[PDB]
Enzyme design. Structure first.
Site, PDB file in Angstrom:
ATOM      1  N   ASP A  15      72.841  76.976  26.504  1.00  0.00           N
ATOM      2  CA  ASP A  15      72.190  75.615  26.371  1.00  0.00           C
ATOM      3  C   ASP A  15      71.761  75.307  24.925  1.00  0.00           C
ATOM      4  OD1 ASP A  15      69.815  77.078  26.156  1.00  0.00           O
ATOM      5  OD2 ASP A  15      69.111  76.562  28.187  1.00  0.00           O
ATOM      6  N   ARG A  29      69.381  71.838  21.429  1.00  0.00           N
ATOM      7  CA  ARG A  29      69.046  72.301  22.759  1.00  0.00           C
ATOM      8  C   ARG A  29      69.429  71.181  23.739  1.00  0.00           C
ATOM      9  NH1 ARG A  29      67.902  73.439  27.436  1.00  0.00           N
ATOM     10  NH2 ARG A  29      66.339  74.966  28.107  1.00  0.00           N
ATOM     11  N   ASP A  34      68.596  74.171  32.012  1.00  0.00           N
ATOM     12  CA  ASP A  34      68.182  75.530  31.653  1.00  0.00           C
ATOM     13  C   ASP A  34      69.267  76.457  32.086  1.00  0.00           C
ATOM     14  OD1 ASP A  34      66.443  77.448  30.463  1.00  0.00           O
ATOM     15  OD2 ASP A  34      65.547  77.914  32.419  1.00  0.00           O
ATOM     16  N   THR A  35      69.908  77.064  31.120  1.00  0.00           N
ATOM     17  CA  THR A  35      70.790  78.158  31.385  1.00  0.00           C
ATOM     18  C   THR A  35      70.043  79.492  31.361  1.00  0.00           C
ATOM     19  OG1 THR A  35      71.509  78.209  29.038  1.00  0.00           O
ATOM     20  CG2 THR A  35      72.976  77.017  30.593  1.00  0.00           C
ATOM     21  N   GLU A  37      69.150  83.163  29.979  1.00  0.00           N
ATOM     22  CA  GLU A  37      69.328  83.880  28.703  1.00  0.00           C
ATOM     23  C   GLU A  37      70.558  84.802  28.820  1.00  0.00           C
ATOM     24  OE1 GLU A  37      67.304  82.872  26.138  1.00  0.00           O
ATOM     25  OE2 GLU A  37      66.448  81.364  27.567  1.00  0.00           O
ATOM     26  N   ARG A  75      64.565  72.232  17.119  1.00  0.00           N
ATOM     27  CA  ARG A  75      65.872  72.003  17.730  1.00  0.00           C
ATOM     28  C   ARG A  75      66.059  70.557  18.104  1.00  0.00           C
ATOM     29  NH1 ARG A  75      65.712  76.481  22.424  1.00  0.00           N
ATOM     30  NH2 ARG A  75      64.163  74.947  23.059  1.00  0.00           N
TER      31      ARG A  75
END
Ligand SMILES: Cc1cn([C@H]2C[C@H](OP(=O)(O)O)[C@@H](COP(=O)(O)O)O2)c(=O)[nH]c1=O
Ligand SMILES: [Ca+2]
EC number: 3.1.31.1
Length: 129
Positions: A15, A29, A34-35, A37, A75
Site C-alpha cells: 500500500d 500511501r 490497508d495491506t 506488512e 506520505r
C-alpha cells in the site's frame, strides 16, 4: 477529483510506492486501504501485486481526494491508477487489502471499495480465506 501524472520510482510494499510527482520523489500511501506488512500473512502477495501493477503500467496517475494530501509521516495520500485501473480498488477486490483508514473528507471512493471488499469476501479470497 482529477487524475494527474506521475512515474514509478520504486515499489515499496502493498500500500506504499515511491513515485515522481510534479518532478519530485514522494512516497505515496494508498487511500482507504490497508495491506498486511511484508512480514505478515499475505504481505508478500500484496507487495508483489502492487509492484507488478505499477511496473507493468504504461501510465501511472495519482488522484488526490478532497482533504489532506499528505499524512503525518510526509506520505502522499492518493488513489493511484495504473493504465486507468485503480490500484487501491484492485487490491481490495483481490482480498489483498481491507478497506481501512476511512477518514471524513478523504473518503470519495469508499463505497466503490466496500463493494469490491464484499465481492472479495464472498469469494473467500486471500485475506478472507
Ligand atoms: C491511509 C492513511 C494512514 N494514515 C496514518 C494512520 C496510521 O497512523 P499510525 O502509524 O499512528 O498508526 C498510519 C497507518 O499507515 P500504515 O498502514 O502505512 O502503517 O498512517 C493517515 O493519517 N491517513 C491515511 O489516509
Ligand atoms: Ca499497511
Amino acid at each position: 477529483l482529477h487524475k494527474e501524472p506521475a512515474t514509478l520510482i520504486k515499489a515499496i510494499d502493498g500500500d506504499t510506492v515511491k513515485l515522481m510527482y510534479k518532478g519530485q520523489p514522494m512516497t505515496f500511501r494508498l487511500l482507504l486501504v490497508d495491506t498486511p506488512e511484508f512480514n505478515e500473512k499475505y504481505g508478500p502477495e500484496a507487495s508483489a501485486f502492487t509492484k507488478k501493477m505499477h511496473e507493468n503500467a504504461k501510465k501511472i496517475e495519482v488522484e488526490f481526494d478532497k482533504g489532506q494530501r499528505t499524512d503525518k509521516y510526509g506520505r502522499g495520500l492518493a488513489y493511484i491508477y495504473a493504465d486507468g485501473k485503480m490500484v487501491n480498488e484492485a487490491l481490495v477486490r483481490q482480498g489483498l487489502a481491507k478497506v481501512a483508514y476511512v477518514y471524513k473528507g478523504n473518503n470519495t471512493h469508499e463505497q466503490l471499495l466496500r463493494k469490491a471488499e464484499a465481492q472479495a469476501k464472498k469469494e473467500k479470497l486471500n485475506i478472507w480465506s
